[PDB]
Coordinates of C-alpha atoms in Angstrom, one line a residue:
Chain K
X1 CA -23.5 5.0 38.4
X2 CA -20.0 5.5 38.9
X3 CA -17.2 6.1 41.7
X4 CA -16.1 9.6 41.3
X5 CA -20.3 9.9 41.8
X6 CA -20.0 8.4 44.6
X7 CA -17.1 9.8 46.1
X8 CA -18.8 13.5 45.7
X9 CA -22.1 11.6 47.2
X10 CA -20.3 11.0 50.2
X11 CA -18.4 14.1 50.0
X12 CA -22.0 16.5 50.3
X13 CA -23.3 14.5 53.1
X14 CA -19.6 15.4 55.3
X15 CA -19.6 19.2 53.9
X16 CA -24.1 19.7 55.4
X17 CA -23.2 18.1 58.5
X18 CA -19.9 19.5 59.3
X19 CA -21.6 22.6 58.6
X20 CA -24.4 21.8 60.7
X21 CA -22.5 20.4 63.4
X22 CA -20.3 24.0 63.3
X23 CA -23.7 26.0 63.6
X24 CA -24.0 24.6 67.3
X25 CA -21.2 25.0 70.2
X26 CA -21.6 21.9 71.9
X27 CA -20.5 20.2 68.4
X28 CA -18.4 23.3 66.7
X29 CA -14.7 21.8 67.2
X30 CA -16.5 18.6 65.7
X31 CA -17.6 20.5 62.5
X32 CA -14.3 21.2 60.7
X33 CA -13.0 17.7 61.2
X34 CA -15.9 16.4 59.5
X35 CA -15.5 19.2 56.5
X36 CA -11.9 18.0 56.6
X37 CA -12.8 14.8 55.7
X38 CA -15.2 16.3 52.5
X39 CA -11.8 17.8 51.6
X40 CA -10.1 15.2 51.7
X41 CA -12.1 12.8 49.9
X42 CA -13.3 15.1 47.3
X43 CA -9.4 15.7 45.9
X44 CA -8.7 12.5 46.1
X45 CA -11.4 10.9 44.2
X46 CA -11.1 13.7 41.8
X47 CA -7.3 12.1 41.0
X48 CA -9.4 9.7 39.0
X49 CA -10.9 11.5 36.5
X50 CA -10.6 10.5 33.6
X51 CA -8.1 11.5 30.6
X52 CA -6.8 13.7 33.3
X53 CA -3.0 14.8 32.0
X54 CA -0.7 17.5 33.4
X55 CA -0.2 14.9 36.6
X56 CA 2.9 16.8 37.9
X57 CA 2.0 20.3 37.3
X58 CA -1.2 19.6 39.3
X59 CA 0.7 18.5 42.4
X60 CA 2.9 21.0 42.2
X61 CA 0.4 23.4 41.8
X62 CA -1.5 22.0 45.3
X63 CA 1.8 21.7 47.3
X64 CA 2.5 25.3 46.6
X65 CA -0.8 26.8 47.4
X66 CA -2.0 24.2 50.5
X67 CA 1.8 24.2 52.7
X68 CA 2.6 28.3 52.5
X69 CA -1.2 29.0 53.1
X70 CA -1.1 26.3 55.6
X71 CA 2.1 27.7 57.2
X72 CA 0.8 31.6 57.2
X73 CA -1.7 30.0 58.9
X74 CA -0.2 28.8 62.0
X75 CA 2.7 31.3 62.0
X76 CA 0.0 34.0 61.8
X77 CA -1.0 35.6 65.4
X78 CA -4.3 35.3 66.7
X79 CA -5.8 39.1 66.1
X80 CA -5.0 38.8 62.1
X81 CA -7.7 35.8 61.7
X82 CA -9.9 38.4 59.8
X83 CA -7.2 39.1 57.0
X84 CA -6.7 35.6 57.3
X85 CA -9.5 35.2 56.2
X86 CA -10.1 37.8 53.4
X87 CA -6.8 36.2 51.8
X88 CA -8.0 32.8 51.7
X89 CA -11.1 34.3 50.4
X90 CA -9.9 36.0 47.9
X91 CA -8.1 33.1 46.6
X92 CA -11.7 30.9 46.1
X93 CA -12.7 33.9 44.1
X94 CA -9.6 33.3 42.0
X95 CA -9.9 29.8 41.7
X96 CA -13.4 30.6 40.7
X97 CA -12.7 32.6 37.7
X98 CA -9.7 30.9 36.7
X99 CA -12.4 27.8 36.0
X100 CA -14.3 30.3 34.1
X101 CA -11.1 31.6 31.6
X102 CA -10.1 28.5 31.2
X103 CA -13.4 27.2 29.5
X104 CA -14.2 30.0 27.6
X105 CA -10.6 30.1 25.9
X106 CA -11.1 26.9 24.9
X107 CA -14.4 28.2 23.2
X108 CA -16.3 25.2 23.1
X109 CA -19.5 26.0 25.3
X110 CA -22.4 24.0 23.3
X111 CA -24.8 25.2 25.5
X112 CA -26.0 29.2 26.2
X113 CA -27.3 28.8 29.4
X114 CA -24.4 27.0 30.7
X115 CA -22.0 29.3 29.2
X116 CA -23.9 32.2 31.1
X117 CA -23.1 30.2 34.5
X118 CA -19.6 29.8 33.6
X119 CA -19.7 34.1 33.0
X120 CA -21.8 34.7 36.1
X121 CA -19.3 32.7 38.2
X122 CA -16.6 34.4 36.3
X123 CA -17.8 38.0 37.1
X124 CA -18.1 37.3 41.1
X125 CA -15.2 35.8 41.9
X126 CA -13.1 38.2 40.4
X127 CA -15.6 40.6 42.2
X128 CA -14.4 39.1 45.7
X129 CA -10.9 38.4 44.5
X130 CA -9.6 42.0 44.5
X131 CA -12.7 43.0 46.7
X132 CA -11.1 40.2 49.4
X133 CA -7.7 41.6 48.6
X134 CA -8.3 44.8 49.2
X135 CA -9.9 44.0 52.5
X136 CA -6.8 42.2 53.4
X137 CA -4.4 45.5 53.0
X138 CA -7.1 47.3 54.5
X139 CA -6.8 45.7 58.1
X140 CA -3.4 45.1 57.6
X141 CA -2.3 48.1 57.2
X142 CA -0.4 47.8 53.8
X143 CA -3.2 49.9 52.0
X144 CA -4.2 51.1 55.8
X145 CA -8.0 52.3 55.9
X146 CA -10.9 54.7 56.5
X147 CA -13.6 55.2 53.9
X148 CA -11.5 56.3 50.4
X149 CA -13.9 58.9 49.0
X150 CA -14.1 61.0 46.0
X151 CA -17.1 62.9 44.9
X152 CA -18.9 60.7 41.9
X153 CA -17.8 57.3 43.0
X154 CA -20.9 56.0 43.3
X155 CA -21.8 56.6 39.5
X156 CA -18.5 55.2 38.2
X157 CA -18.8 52.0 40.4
X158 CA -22.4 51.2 38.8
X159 CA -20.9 52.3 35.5
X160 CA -18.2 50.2 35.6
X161 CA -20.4 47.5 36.7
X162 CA -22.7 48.0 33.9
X163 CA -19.8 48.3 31.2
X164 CA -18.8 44.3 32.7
X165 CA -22.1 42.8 32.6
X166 CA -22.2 44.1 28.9
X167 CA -18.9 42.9 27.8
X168 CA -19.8 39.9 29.8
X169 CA -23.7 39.1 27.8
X170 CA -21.0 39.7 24.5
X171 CA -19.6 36.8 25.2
X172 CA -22.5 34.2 24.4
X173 CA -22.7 35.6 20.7
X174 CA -18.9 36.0 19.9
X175 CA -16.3 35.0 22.7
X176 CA -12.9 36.4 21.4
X177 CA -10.3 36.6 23.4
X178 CA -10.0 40.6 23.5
X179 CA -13.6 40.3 24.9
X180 CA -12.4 37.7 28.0
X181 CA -9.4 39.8 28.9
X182 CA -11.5 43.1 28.7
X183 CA -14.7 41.0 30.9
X184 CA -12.2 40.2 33.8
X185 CA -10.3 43.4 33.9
X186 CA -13.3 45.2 34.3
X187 CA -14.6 42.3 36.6
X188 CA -11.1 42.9 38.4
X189 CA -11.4 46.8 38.7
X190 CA -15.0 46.8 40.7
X191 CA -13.7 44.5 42.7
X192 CA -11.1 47.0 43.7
X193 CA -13.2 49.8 42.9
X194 CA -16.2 48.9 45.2
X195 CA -14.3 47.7 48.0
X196 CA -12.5 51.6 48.7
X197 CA -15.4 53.5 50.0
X198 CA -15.8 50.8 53.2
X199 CA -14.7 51.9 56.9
X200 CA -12.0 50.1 58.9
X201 CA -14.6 48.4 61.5
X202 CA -16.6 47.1 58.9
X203 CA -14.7 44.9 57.3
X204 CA -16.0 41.8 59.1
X205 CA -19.3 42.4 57.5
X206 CA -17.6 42.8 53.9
X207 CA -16.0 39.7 54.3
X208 CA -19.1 37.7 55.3
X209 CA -20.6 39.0 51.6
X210 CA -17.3 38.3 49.8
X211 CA -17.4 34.5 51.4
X212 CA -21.1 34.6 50.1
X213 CA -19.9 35.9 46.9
X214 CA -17.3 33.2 46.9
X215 CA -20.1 30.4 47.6
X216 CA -22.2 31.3 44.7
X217 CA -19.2 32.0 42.4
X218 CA -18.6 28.0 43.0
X219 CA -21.5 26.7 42.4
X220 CA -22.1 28.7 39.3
X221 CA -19.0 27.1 37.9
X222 CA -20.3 23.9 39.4
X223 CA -23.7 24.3 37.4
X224 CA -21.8 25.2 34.4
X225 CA -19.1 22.5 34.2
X226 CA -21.0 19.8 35.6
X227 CA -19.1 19.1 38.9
X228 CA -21.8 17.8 41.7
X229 CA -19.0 18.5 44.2
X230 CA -19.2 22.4 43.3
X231 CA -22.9 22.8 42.7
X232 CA -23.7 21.4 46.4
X233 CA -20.7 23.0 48.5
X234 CA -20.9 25.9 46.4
X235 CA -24.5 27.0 46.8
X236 CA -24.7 25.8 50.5
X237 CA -22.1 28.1 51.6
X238 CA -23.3 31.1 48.9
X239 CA -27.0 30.8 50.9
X240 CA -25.7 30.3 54.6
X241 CA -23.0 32.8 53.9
X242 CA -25.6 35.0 52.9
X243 CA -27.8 34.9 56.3
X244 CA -24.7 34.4 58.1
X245 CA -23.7 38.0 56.8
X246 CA -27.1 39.7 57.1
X247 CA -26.7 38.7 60.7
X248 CA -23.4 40.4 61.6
X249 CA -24.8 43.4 60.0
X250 CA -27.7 43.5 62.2
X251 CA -25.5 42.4 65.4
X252 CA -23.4 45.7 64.5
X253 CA -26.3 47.6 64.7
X254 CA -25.8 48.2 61.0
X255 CA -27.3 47.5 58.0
X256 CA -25.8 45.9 55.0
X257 CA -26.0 48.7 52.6
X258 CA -24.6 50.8 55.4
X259 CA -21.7 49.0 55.4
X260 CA -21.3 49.2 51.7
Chain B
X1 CA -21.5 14.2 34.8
X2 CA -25.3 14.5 32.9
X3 CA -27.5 16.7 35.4
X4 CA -30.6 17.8 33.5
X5 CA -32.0 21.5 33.9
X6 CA -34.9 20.7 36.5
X7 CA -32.8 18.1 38.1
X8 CA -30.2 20.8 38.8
X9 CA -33.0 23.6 39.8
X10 CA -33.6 21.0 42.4
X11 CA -30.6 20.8 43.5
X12 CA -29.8 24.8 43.5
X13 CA -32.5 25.4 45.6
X14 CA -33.0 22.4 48.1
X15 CA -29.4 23.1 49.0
X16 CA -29.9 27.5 49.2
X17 CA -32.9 26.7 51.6
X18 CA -30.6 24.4 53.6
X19 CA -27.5 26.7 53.7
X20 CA -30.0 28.9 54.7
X21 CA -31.8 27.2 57.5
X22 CA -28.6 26.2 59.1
X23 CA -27.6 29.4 60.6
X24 CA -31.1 30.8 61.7
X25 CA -30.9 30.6 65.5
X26 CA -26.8 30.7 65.5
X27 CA -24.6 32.1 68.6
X28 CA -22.7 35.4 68.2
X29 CA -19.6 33.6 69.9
X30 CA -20.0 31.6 66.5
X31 CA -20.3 33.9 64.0
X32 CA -16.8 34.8 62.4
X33 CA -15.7 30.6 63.3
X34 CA -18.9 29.3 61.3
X35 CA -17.5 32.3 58.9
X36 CA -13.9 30.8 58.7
X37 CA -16.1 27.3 58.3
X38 CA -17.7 28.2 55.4
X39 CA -14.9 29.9 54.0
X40 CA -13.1 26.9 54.4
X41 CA -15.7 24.5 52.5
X42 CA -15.6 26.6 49.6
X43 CA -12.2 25.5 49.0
X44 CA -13.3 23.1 47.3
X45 CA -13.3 24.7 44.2
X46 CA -9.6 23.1 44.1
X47 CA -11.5 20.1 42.8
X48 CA -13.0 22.2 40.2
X49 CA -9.6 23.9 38.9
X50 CA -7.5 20.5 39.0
X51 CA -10.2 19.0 36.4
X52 CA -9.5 22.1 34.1
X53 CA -6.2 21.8 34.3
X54 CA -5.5 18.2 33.3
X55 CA -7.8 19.3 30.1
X56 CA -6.0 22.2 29.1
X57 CA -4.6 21.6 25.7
X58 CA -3.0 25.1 24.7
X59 CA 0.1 27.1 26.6
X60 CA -2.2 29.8 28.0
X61 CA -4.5 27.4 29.1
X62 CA -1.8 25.5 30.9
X63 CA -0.8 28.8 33.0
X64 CA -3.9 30.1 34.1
X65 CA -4.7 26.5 34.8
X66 CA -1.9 26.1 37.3
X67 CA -2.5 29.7 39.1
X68 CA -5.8 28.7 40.4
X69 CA -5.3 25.3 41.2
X70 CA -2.6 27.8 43.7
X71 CA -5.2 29.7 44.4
X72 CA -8.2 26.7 45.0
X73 CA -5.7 25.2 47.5
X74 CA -4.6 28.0 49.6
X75 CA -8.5 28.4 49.9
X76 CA -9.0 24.9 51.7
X77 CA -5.8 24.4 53.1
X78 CA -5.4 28.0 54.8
X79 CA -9.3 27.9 55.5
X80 CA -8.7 24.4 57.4
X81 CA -5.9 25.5 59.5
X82 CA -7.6 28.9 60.5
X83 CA -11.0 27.5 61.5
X84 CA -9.4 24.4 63.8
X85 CA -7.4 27.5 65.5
X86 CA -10.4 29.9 65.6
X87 CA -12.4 26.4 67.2
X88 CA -10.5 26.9 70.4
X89 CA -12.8 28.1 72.4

């Protein structure tokens, strides 16, 4: 029993119900504040933990990322909310994997199974971080987008797939740093690479997976690390995210697999 | 933090079925908000990054650190702002 436990206690109860409380109209505005609060609390027990150096870099590192996300966000007209929302996607993918680097440069992984969390997690975030990035440019018109075809993409994409998940297993046996650069440059590519063949109106539904995507990616790392704050959030908004997808696919008349 | 393997099944799935059963019978209207929502709580990788960072021993480690403690926070502080806005309705 300790504080930081309790602090993340507290901090899954305010995540459920502001989610919950966001599923229904009649209590949606409600919902966020309540999250906020989760947020909040969660980075500021975390401050405690313990042997925690590198104080300064850390806060510069959130005052950069929170105040110019924060400020696109208001300065941001109301039609580019999807982008919006891409963008901040793809970051959580980022953060995901940079968890994932981090711990398997430092090597020490006495554990297989955990170590195959910290990869999984690894893989999918990277997955939506260029996938989320490329949806961005997409809508906004930097990349500007109908379907990108060419005649064997399908093959490559699966291959290239396939070529990560192997480099990725390597790992577990021998981790060397050639093999983690290698994992999330291929990792990085299908990303990219399986986000091109997907039509301008569908984006929504892409995003909706990537945000799933996102949620697992999370609580993976969570799993694998140890971090009760991650496992919950994470795989609560990897599952709802999930659904929550399916059902904009089927509200579009499509189907998922169409879309992709 | 010592979670043991059944322990955390538990936990993985009780929570999946929840996030699940949340958003059965959920509005249209709602959709992309509760989207932004969710988005929003996974922001909290921040949390997840920060802890890496203050560990990192090694240079490398140290810059990749930072980057997605960037990244992390943009997720929950641009996911916060957006959602509030998109919950005017």
């Amino acid at each position: 029993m300790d504080l930081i436990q309790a602090a993340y206690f507290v901090v899954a109860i305010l995540f459920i119900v502001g989610l919950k409380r966001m599923a229904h109209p009649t209590t949606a505005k409600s919902g966020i504040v309540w999250a906020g609060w989760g947020m909040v609390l969660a980075v500021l027990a975390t401050f405690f933990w313990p042997g925690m150096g590198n104080f300064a870099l850390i806060l510069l590192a959130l005052l950069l990322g929170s105040v110019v996300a924060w400020w696109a966000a208001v300065r941001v007209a109301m039609t580019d909310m999807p982008q919006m929302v891409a963008i901040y996607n793809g970051m959580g993918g980022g953060a995901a994997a940079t968890i994932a680097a981090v711990e398997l440069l430092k090597g020490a992984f006495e554990n297989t199974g955990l170590m195959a969390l910290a990869i999984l997690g690894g893989l999918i975030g990277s997955v939506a971080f260029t996938g989320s990035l490329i949806a961005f440019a997409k809508l906004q018109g930097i990349m500007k987008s109908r379907p990108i075809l060419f005649p064997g993409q399908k093959a490559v994409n699966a291959l290239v797939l396939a070529l990560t998940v192997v480099i990725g297993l390597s790992l577990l046996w021998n981790d060397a740093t050639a093999s983690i650069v290698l994992f999330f440059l291929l990792a990085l590519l299908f990303g990219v690479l399986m986000t091109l063949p997907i039509g301008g109106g569908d984006m929504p539904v892409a995003i909706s997976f990537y945000n799933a995507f996102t949620g697992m990616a999370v609580g993976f790392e969570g799993f694998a690390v140890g971090n009760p704050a991650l496992m919950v959030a994470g795989t609560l908004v990897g599952a709802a995210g999930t659904l929550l997808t399916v059902l904009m696919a089927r509200a579009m008349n499509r189907s998922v697999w169409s879309v992709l | 933090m010592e979670f043991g393997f059944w322990s955390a099944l538990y936990i993985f799935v009780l929570t999946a079925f929840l996030g699940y059963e949340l958003i059965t019978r959920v509005p249209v209207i709602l959709h992309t908000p509760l989207m932004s929502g969710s988005n929003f709580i996974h922001g909290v990788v921040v949390v997840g990054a920060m802890v890496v960072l203050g560990h990192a021993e090694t240079g490398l480690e140290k810059l990749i650190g930072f980057l997605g403690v960037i990244l992390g926070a943009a997720n929950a502080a641009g996911g916060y702002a957006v959602t509030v806005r998109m919950l005017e309705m």
